[PDB]
Enzyme design. Sequence first.
Site, PDB file in Angstrom:
ATOM      1  CB  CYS B 109       2.277  -8.696   2.211  1.00  0.00           C
ATOM      2  SG  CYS B 109       3.491  -7.385   3.027  1.00  0.00           S
ATOM      3  NE  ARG B 112       1.467  -7.415  -1.762  1.00  0.00           N
ATOM      4  CZ  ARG B 112       0.386  -8.770  -2.796  1.00  0.00           C
ATOM      5  NH1 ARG B 112       1.803  -9.148  -3.992  1.00  0.00           N
ATOM      6  NH2 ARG B 112      -0.426  -7.757  -2.619  1.00  0.00           N
ATOM      7  CD1 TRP B 281       7.605   0.536   8.362  1.00  0.00           C
ATOM      8  CD2 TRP B 281       9.137  -0.587   7.280  1.00  0.00           C
ATOM      9  NE1 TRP B 281       7.421  -0.001   6.516  1.00  0.00           N
ATOM     10  CE2 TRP B 281       8.483  -0.338   6.789  1.00  0.00           C
ATOM     11  CE3 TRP B 281      10.582  -0.970   6.932  1.00  0.00           C
ATOM     12  CZ2 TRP B 281       8.891   0.373   5.053  1.00  0.00           C
ATOM     13  CZ3 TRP B 281      10.693  -0.807   5.940  1.00  0.00           C
ATOM     14  CH2 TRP B 281      10.097   0.156   4.831  1.00  0.00           C
ATOM     15  CD  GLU B 286       1.338  -4.957  10.560  1.00  0.00           C
ATOM     16  OE1 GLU B 286       1.673  -6.342  10.324  1.00  0.00           O
ATOM     17  OE2 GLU B 286       1.970  -4.487  10.332  1.00  0.00           O
TER      18      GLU B 286
HETATM   19  C1  HEM Z   1       8.568  -3.681   5.567  1.00  0.00           C
HETATM   20  C2  HEM Z   1       6.881  -2.997   5.441  1.00  0.00           C
HETATM   21  C3  HEM Z   1       6.299  -4.352   6.036  1.00  0.00           C
HETATM   22  C4  HEM Z   1       4.213  -3.957   6.718  1.00  0.00           C
HETATM   23  C5  HEM Z   1       3.853  -2.107   6.924  1.00  0.00           C
HETATM   24  C6  HEM Z   1       4.249  -5.144   6.675  1.00  0.00           C
HETATM   25  C7  HEM Z   1       2.531  -5.393   6.526  1.00  0.00           C
HETATM   26  C8  HEM Z   1       1.959  -6.505   6.123  1.00  0.00           C
HETATM   27  C9  HEM Z   1       0.524  -6.268   7.184  1.00  0.00           C
HETATM   28  C10 HEM Z   1      -0.190  -5.250   7.560  1.00  0.00           C
HETATM   29  C11 HEM Z   1       0.215  -7.890   6.897  1.00  0.00           C
HETATM   30  C12 HEM Z   1      -1.565  -8.336   7.604  1.00  0.00           C
HETATM   31  C13 HEM Z   1      -0.844  -8.376   9.000  1.00  0.00           C
HETATM   32  C14 HEM Z   1      -1.949  -8.725   9.981  1.00  0.00           C
HETATM   33  O1  HEM Z   1      -3.410  -8.196   9.939  1.00  0.00           O
HETATM   34  O2  HEM Z   1      -2.188  -9.700  10.796  1.00  0.00           O
HETATM   35  C15 HEM Z   1       1.089  -8.640   6.236  1.00  0.00           C
HETATM   36  C16 HEM Z   1       1.289  -9.706   6.136  1.00  0.00           C
HETATM   37  C17 HEM Z   1       2.100 -11.041   5.469  1.00  0.00           C
HETATM   38  N1  HEM Z   1       3.691 -10.293   5.517  1.00  0.00           N
HETATM   39 FE1  HEM Z   1       3.638  -8.094   4.493  1.00  0.00          FE
HETATM   40  N2  HEM Z   1       5.044  -6.087   6.138  1.00  0.00           N
HETATM   41  C18 HEM Z   1       6.074  -5.348   5.688  1.00  0.00           C
HETATM   42  C19 HEM Z   1       7.141  -6.289   5.480  1.00  0.00           C
HETATM   43  C20 HEM Z   1       7.057  -7.700   4.712  1.00  0.00           C
HETATM   44  C21 HEM Z   1       8.063  -8.427   4.652  1.00  0.00           C
HETATM   45  C22 HEM Z   1       9.201  -7.915   4.140  1.00  0.00           C
HETATM   46  C23 HEM Z   1       8.313  -9.691   3.919  1.00  0.00           C
HETATM   47  C24 HEM Z   1       8.258 -11.030   3.657  1.00  0.00           C
HETATM   48  C25 HEM Z   1       9.740 -10.790   3.012  1.00  0.00           C
HETATM   49  C26 HEM Z   1       6.193  -9.546   4.375  1.00  0.00           C
HETATM   50  C27 HEM Z   1       6.181 -11.358   4.578  1.00  0.00           C
HETATM   51  C28 HEM Z   1       4.726 -11.255   4.368  1.00  0.00           C
HETATM   52  C29 HEM Z   1       3.273 -11.962   4.546  1.00  0.00           C
HETATM   53  C30 HEM Z   1       3.612 -13.864   3.976  1.00  0.00           C
HETATM   54  C31 HEM Z   1       1.918 -11.366   5.465  1.00  0.00           C
HETATM   55  C32 HEM Z   1       1.407 -13.313   4.914  1.00  0.00           C
HETATM   56  C33 HEM Z   1       1.332 -13.743   6.126  1.00  0.00           C
HETATM   57  C34 HEM Z   1       0.223 -14.970   6.018  1.00  0.00           C
HETATM   58  O3  HEM Z   1       0.124 -15.554   5.120  1.00  0.00           O
HETATM   59  O4  HEM Z   1      -0.802 -14.001   7.151  1.00  0.00           O
HETATM   60  N3  HEM Z   1       5.618  -8.556   4.467  1.00  0.00           N
HETATM   61  N4  HEM Z   1       2.163  -7.935   6.082  1.00  0.00           N
END
Ligand code: HEM
Lengths: 419, 411
Positions: B109, B112, B281, B286
């Site tokens: 992610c 973070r 968000w 994406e």
């Molecule tokens: C608030 C703004 C956030 C942004 C901009 C963001 C952005 C991203 C992006 C771009 C990815 C890659 C997704 C893809 O390319 O398919 C990702 C993965 C992920 N995000 Fe974040 N995220 C946010 C919030 C969160 C929150 C609030 C959580 C959990 C509490 C979270 C948990 C995760 C997890 C677990 C993954 C990886 C999932 C996997 O293992 O495939 N994210 N995020």
Amino acid sequence: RFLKVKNWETEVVLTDTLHLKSTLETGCTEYICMGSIMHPSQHARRPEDVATKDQLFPLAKEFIDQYYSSIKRFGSKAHMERLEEVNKEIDTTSTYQLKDTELIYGAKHAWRNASRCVGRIQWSKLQVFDARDCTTAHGMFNYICNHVKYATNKGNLRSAITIFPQRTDGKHDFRVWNSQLIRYAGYKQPDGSTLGDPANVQFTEICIQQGWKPPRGRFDVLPLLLQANGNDPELFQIPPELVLEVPIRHPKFEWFKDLGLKWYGLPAVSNMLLEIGGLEFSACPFSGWYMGTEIGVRDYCDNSRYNILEEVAKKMNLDMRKTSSLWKDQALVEINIAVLYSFQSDKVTIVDHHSATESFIKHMENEYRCRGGCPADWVWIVPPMSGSITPVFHQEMLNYRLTPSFEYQPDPWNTHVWK
Amino acid sequence: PRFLKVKNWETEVVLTDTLHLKSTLETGCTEYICMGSIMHPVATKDQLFPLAKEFIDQYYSSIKRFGSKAHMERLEEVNKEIDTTSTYQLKDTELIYGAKHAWRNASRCVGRIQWSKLQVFDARDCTTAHGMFNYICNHVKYATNKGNLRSAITIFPQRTDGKHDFRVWNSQLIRYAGYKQPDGSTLGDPANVQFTEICIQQGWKPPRGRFDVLPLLLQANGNDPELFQIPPELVLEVPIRHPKFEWFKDLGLKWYGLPAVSNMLLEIGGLEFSACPFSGWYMGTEIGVRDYCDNSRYNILEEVAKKMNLDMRKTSSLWKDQALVEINIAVLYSFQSDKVTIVDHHSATESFIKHMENEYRCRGGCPADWVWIVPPMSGSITPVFHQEMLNYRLTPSFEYQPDPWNTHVWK
Ligand code: HEM
Ligand code: HEM
Ligand SMILES: Cc1cc(N)nc2cc(-c3ccc(CN)cc3O)c(F)cc12
Ligand SMILES: C[C@H](O)[C@H](O)[C@H]1CNc2nc(N)[nH]c(=O)c2N1
Ligand SMILES: C[C@H](O)[C@H](O)[C@H]1CNc2nc(N)[nH]c(=O)c2N1
Ligand SMILES: [Zn+2]
């Protein structure tokens, strides 16, 4: 046990058994992945300097076994005599010499095994120039000129490697001090900025400090700095008619050519080490042809490289106040359109990232079918722009270290004791 | 060793990772093969004991109370529950700490830097699918906040025997339906065709339009899932127009504002929370790179390139690259115009580098998955591309889990 890789776009699953033949550590463990570390491991197959017999011979047996297996001998009369020949030679000189066939086999398989190379569909079509009889910097320069001429082939580029004498005790190395045979100088300006190519600022300065008189332009082909038998390196100017260059123009933006940009046609890496059966060829310059992104994404756009993004953006009348206009992304595409258009117009070999990645997927299918696997480093195979719209983005890959191989090695000026 | 170094090759900055010494579970790599690009490489009493201990120790360390009287009593209180009931219950403070740290520990992610600002909704008292719907609606409304998006998670009862799981069957809370046509074409989002069929089979009456918001398929206590229609006034949507191309709006495209992933499992102290929808968000790519432009998605790449009068005969024109940039420009312009929170890949990756450097400072490291942190377009002109990263698995963590229709025993 036996590992599967899946392509999430086609659902094709491939089954890898070749990894079972891998010898060197990748740097990863069950608990840490190092796949984005540039040099994750120092696990070499041999130690410091001239190895003892029990160090060099088992590596030599392995490569000789592998070569005689490759031609459906193994146990044959020639195989067993070869083992005796290597044994006596190590007993009497602490090293051994490769046959021409073994040398050619080893260089091709070093390329075949290069997990970072998207170009490997061509691996068995490699011209090998044996330069093991070379003794001086002048001789190295002669070999390199002939390499450059053959490989350039008036724009119909041909893959080639030139192989200089192997390492003996480590105080008599052959080295090409250049990182590539053809690169542009980088000049450290007094007002703190940089003229030319910023990657090469240090090497550019070594050349000046060696007696090179820089013309101090923006596209100064660097001299060759060649080291033979551990002696001090010597400067040589590649004859310009051997350095094919492509003027960069744009098929729609007529103002593009007025940026006064060009690049050279031949990529020829000259600072890597080629390792075959425990032997180490520290000077083995090898060349193919460019993927367009290597010039136009990396060589013009890295922040510590040419960085002419803004000017292309300015010329394109783009909002450069905020990133969310994606002005960098827009200019980056146009530059890569221009690079490809120029090389194709001048009939200089080049490949776009869509075509190169498609070919690599095909190569992967071939390798799993006939060899049981293909080592591939996703971090380096995926192109630096438009990654998710190329087929390799969605392709799982297994990375592992097979021998023969190309290895990094320290820049000789951290190591060299002058005289 | 005791240290591992990562280097940024663009800035030359070098950071030292000591945190990886605390990773306890596997990456999938071995010493001789790296699996960094493979997508996916109940506890007994005696299994649960050390996992609980490790988490409670971690929590009491974080609050500078390690070894304290409250720490030792919490420890004793947990072992008794495990002994008597074969499981235990997190305190509210621990639940919040666990949810926040599972996000902090998510190596894939890039978002973070925001991890400590997570609104945690405790839904462990929920018993029925109707109750889940009510919880999920309040989540959606809170997180959406009229476009001023706020990150949130809603945590349903943990796993007990594996036969009474809570599950959101949707992969995200808000997705559009996909319908495969007799002639082989696809209406709507091709990524959701399977789940769309599952919903129709459960009785959903599909509008058979292009942007049908799917219904929620909610499973409580291991019973058959149940269908619910999210109230439309709770689904914030953004019509996609382009700032220069008048014709772009005529493609009739829109997207939803709230990304809310609902099919992952939250693991805290050996406890498994099989239903834990969380939302943040969007990063623009994406939607614009992956939600319109994968060949297994809407495939308006070809449409945008046609309307751009691009030479689509040879790839080396880079018409695909050119059209991908414009779609992503339109996505960002549209969200910003409608005052719906979105972040572009340049801002996001820069923030993530700042976050990573801060985590190395105060925490001793930050696990990161370069394969996933690097955006799916224009990779090398973003600053993470030149950043070496170490990948390892800390707990609490978010984990993948199989789709519930693969394992559910229908009643
Ligand atoms: C608030 C703004 C956030 C942004 C901009 C963001 C952005 C991203 C992006 C771009 C990815 C890659 C997704 C893809 O390319 O398919 C990702 C993965 C992920 N995000 Fe974040 N995220 C946010 C919030 C969160 C929150 C609030 C959580 C959990 C509490 C979270 C948990 C995760 C997890 C677990 C993954 C990886 C999932 C996997 O293992 O495939 N994210 N995020
Ligand atoms: C013929 C056309 C070829 C193409 C299009 C090609 C393409 C590429 C590209 C794009 C890279 C990554 C470069 C970067 O982005 O920094 C690479 C890496 C590499 N190539 Fe190839 N290549 C070709 C030929 C060859 C040949 C002839 C050899 C050796 C015989 C070779 C050996 C390697 C090695 C060893 C690496 C990885 C070096 C490292 O670890 O840093 N390639 N190739
Ligand atoms: C043979 C060949 C052809 C080509 N078209 N490109 C290459 C690029 C590289 C490379 C260079 C520098 C670095 C480190 N900056 C990593 C590489 O993989 C290489 F070794 C060989 C190449
Ligand atoms: C094969 C590969 O692991 C897979 O397609 C991954 C690669 N990296 C990715 N990175 C992001 N951000 N999102 C993805 O869906 C993927 N897909
Ligand atoms: C940090 C990162 O691993 C490193 O900068 C790599 C990433 N992937 C790359 N991929 C290619 N093709 N060329 C590169 O120079 C790099 N650099
Ligand atoms: Zn790994």
